[PDB]
Amino acid sequence: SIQAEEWYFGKITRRESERLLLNAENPRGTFLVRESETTKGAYCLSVSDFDNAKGLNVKHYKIRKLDSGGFYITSRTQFNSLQQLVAYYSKHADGLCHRLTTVCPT
Ligand SMILES: *C(=O)c1cc(C[C@H](NC(C)=O)C(=O)N[C@H]2CCCCN(Cc3ccc(-c4ccccc4)cc3)C2=O)ccc1C(=O)O
Numbered sequence: 001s002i003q004a005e006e007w008y009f010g011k012i013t014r015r016e017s018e019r020l021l022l023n024a025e026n027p028r029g030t031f032l033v034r035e036s037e038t039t040k041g042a043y044c045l046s047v048s049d050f051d052n053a054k055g056l057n058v059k060h061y062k063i064r065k066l067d068s069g070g071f072y073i074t075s076r077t078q079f080n081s082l083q084q085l086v087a088y089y090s091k092h093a094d095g096l097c098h099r100l101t102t103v104c105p106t
Contacts, residue, residue, distance in 0.1 A: 002033075002082050007103040009034045014060065017046040020104050021058045029101030033063070033082065041065055043082070045073070045089075048104070049097035059097045 002008050009017070009032045017034055026048045036042035043063040050056050063085065065071050070078035071085050074095065079085040090100040 005033070005083065005086075007032055007086065008082075009104075011035050013037065014044075014046075017044075017060070017104075018058050020106070021046055021048040022056055023105065024056060026056070026104065027101060028098040030104050031100050031102075032104040033086070036062060039064075045086075045100075046104075047097055047100065061096065 003010070012034050014037055017032060020032065021030060028048060028050050030048040031045060033043055033045050036044050039062070042065060045061045045063055047059050047061070048056065049059055061073050063071055063073055063082070064075070069080065071082050072078040073085070077094070079088065086100060089096055093099045
């Protein structure tokens with residue numbers, strides 16, 4: 001269950017997610033999952049990044065959920081669960097700003 005996952009922050013806004021992620025103590029890959037503000041049924045993965053050009057910054061990725069069952073950021077790479085998707089992205093950066101590392105502090 002998603003609401004049981006420590007990285008699921010539920011109904012929090014984009015600005016709130018950025019407020020939580022823009023903490024200097026957060027290494028790259030700090031993240032959380034929240035409801036999509038615009039697509040019913042979808043979610044968003046907010047991830048902290050850091051580079052010399054931009055400094056500490058946040059990126060937001062839309063996670064689609066199919067009625068057919070698949071969860072994915074890109075339709076080419078789908079998962080049977082949100083947990084599996086998180087697990088996979090904690091190991092592969094792929095198109096993400098950084099692989100997922102630790103859950104964002106509240
Ligand atoms: C969630 O809040 C959400 C997010 C988005 C997309 C987001 N836009 C905004 C307005 O927040 C956005 O544009 N994010 C970027 C992230 C940076 C990369 C560029 N792209 C395109 C993209 C996305 C993902 C990949 C990828 C990732 C992993 C594996 C393979 C490929 C490549 C390219 C972005 O999307 C929209 C809406 C919402 C919402 O809350 O509703």
